[PDB]
Amino acid sequence: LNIADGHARQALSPGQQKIVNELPVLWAESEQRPVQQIESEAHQAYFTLLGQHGYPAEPGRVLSCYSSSVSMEILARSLSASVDRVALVHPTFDNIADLLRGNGLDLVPVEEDALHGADLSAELLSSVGCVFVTTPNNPTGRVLAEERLRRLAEQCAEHGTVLALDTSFRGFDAAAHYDHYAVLQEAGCRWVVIEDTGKLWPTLDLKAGLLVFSEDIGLPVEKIYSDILLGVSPLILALIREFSRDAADGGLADLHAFILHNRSVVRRALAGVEGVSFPDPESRSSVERVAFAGRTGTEVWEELQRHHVFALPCRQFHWAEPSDGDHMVRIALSRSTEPLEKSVQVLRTVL
Amino acid sequence: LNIADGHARQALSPGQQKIVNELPVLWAESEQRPVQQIESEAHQAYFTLLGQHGYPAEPGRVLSCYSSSVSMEILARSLSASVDRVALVHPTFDNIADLLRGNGLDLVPVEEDALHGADLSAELLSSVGCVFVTTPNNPTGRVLAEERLRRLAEQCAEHGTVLALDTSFRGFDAAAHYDHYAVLQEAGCRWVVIEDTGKLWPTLDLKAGLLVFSEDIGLPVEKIYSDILLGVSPLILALIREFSRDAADGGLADLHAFILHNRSVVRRALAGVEGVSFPDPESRSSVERVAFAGRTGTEVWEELQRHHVFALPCRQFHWAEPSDGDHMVRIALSRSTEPLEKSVQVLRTVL
Ligand SMILES: Cc1ncc(COP(=O)(O)O)c(/C=N/[C@H](CCCNC(=N)N)C(=O)O)c1O
Ligand SMILES: Cc1ncc(COP(=O)(O)O)c(/C=N/[C@H](CCCNC(=N)N)C(=O)O)c1O
């Protein structure tokens, strides 16, 4: 009863199973056509699916990577020559912090209330070479609103600061489907976006990170990318294209309704308990934070393990101040509903 | 007419076509069995296929990565924690150098004749924390013989040096099919090997790098691997498993015969031209160097392009002295014979 890893483990839909049934046809197509044609079609399907109409479609402005984390490694190393300090949203997915810090960058935490609620201080922006924002954020689900993205982008441009976005959870929240690329190109900061197909669908970790960057980024992303790969499998791009097309023809709506149901299953199952609260009431992400007073997320985690239920304590996400996450756990929602409901039912009895 | 990229673009055999036809069955399998089980089966079939029987089969000793270059990035960044200087075979695939140099390692080139023909000097082993050998080497095809691998491993153990091997081309040459792991364990040096499935078969870049290391490696490979990925798709591991089994069942002998045929087609078209010569007469790799007098490899490439034939100039492999490769191009042999044959007929008239 794994509710820890955020990737999708629910069954395929009928439309998605039909895609999988035609994998030999996609293989034939991948053998027959220029990879670039399929990649263009995959990018267009995925970006247009999620409202990113102004993405740069000239071949080579979007670099297909095996994963978001590969893209992130390329970005961190590309930053490390010219940047000492990154302002990083806190909490966020902890590997972002480990990848930046492992490549020699010093991190400055920016709390969410500060990031979403007001302009960043000039003193901060002038003291960092990059601002890095996960939107929708993991674990909180919080979406950087369009006006805030615009003001942040403008401020980064004013300060010569790179604006980097990790938009991996984009597909789950329509609030994140306004055209980010329009905003960034309009603002004219040096920017980079890491899109990710890998959390949306149960494609057995067949996915791509998509590293997108402004023409003036002034970082060696293209070169270091080239150092790591020539490209991703056309079969995976064809897969992405088809899953995006199925998503465009109602699949995406069905996925939102399914995550909403599982989020509901979780909140109904725990609402009467303690002492329990749900810090992110408006989140539509595929992961869910749960907070409780009295006990520690680590304790709760330890006890759930005894019952073969595996969630995540939240300490790891508060990468600058782990005690900040002492009283919360994270629960994965991209799960078949029956196994998910068993999981939180154990959680309820433990509490 | 692409004869540049090393990856395989020849037609599927009947038996490989049959594996592609079962991709939906392998998908359902991947959904239903623990990834670790499939991974162990994939590893066992690939290592055993190529004679690497003493590979450490305990889970977690073989780290499955999206590609050999991802494995290489992990190794490079791990080395930089405690190593300043790496001795690297020269020429070799230039990403190996660009990844090491880009993670902050200083490179000492070791020409192939030094590496294969004599012990490494005490002066050299006093100055480097790692020796890195690509075997079979790309682009030369040169195979590190068992006697030299043993002696190299003995010297690394004596000095405390890490011995690192890149064995992506292993499957093409039966001279590389003696058990490298037995040699490395016998010597007791710190060692790391990057195996790669992606050059052998036309799998549309569905592949894994396999990062294997001694228990005393004393480098943070497990931590850095974990920061970049959790694992590779079970569908890709299942495919590796099935392609390795088809190869054990005669595929591999047929592939050796196919590559030999195509090498003969190239040499048939060219060995009487000019001024033309073949630097690596004994190579059995899927890539082939051609030398010429008078003109430059870059200039041959430009003329080939005009006729829509894309080969590779060799400068980039001589990563410490590119002018060493000024008079050579590389030709990909993992190609359908007819396109390859058109390609060299064009290259013939050019020369
Ligand atoms: C905002 C964000 N950006 C990037 C990544 C990197 O994903 P990647 O592994 O490279 O495919 C994550 C990962 N989230 C983790 C899944 C861990 C990887 N899952 C997997 N099985 N491949 C989580 O939320 O549990 C993330 O939340
Ligand atoms: C000894 C060696 N170790 C690692 C690599 C990295 O392999 P990877 O691209 O990560 O799957 C190569 C690559 N050889 C290059 C292929 C270029 C990549 N092709 C692709 N389509 N992804 C060649 O010889 O042409 C190599 O020769």
XYZ file of N, CA and C in Angstrom, chain B residues 118-122 125 148 150-161 187 189:
63
model
N 51.792 -1.105 -22.171
C 52.686 -0.997 -21.029
C 51.918 -0.635 -19.765
N 52.495 -1.023 -18.618
C 52.039 -0.549 -17.322
C 51.998 0.969 -17.296
N 51.009 1.493 -16.595
C 50.987 2.908 -16.292
C 52.163 3.281 -15.395
N 52.749 4.436 -15.670
C 53.946 4.836 -14.959
C 53.610 5.167 -13.516
N 54.629 5.095 -12.661
C 54.439 5.492 -11.268
C 54.140 6.980 -11.176
N 50.394 7.274 -11.926
C 49.560 6.794 -10.832
C 49.764 7.603 -9.543
N 45.809 -7.143 -19.792
C 46.060 -5.739 -19.487
C 45.055 -5.215 -18.475
N 43.750 -6.956 -16.090
C 44.229 -7.450 -14.808
C 45.386 -6.617 -14.299
N 46.348 -6.331 -15.169
C 47.532 -5.627 -14.700
C 47.160 -4.220 -14.262
N 46.251 -3.599 -15.013
C 45.740 -2.266 -14.695
C 45.015 -2.261 -13.351
N 44.144 -3.249 -13.154
C 43.463 -3.413 -11.884
C 44.461 -3.635 -10.750
N 45.521 -4.423 -10.979
C 46.508 -4.639 -9.912
C 47.220 -3.340 -9.523
N 47.590 -2.518 -10.516
C 48.234 -1.220 -10.259
C 47.288 -0.247 -9.558
N 46.021 -0.209 -9.969
C 45.085 0.659 -9.289
C 44.944 0.249 -7.830
N 44.818 -1.054 -7.562
C 44.721 -1.495 -6.183
C 45.973 -1.129 -5.399
N 47.146 -1.269 -6.016
C 48.384 -0.964 -5.318
C 48.459 0.512 -4.941
N 47.894 1.408 -5.763
C 47.989 2.836 -5.531
C 46.742 3.420 -4.895
N 45.666 2.641 -4.769
C 44.411 3.136 -4.246
C 43.566 3.880 -5.259
N 43.881 3.738 -6.537
C 43.190 4.392 -7.632
C 41.901 3.670 -7.988
N 41.558 -8.569 -8.297
C 42.606 -7.601 -8.007
C 42.292 -6.819 -6.743
N 40.959 -3.859 -6.513
C 40.955 -2.410 -6.652
C 39.545 -1.872 -6.441
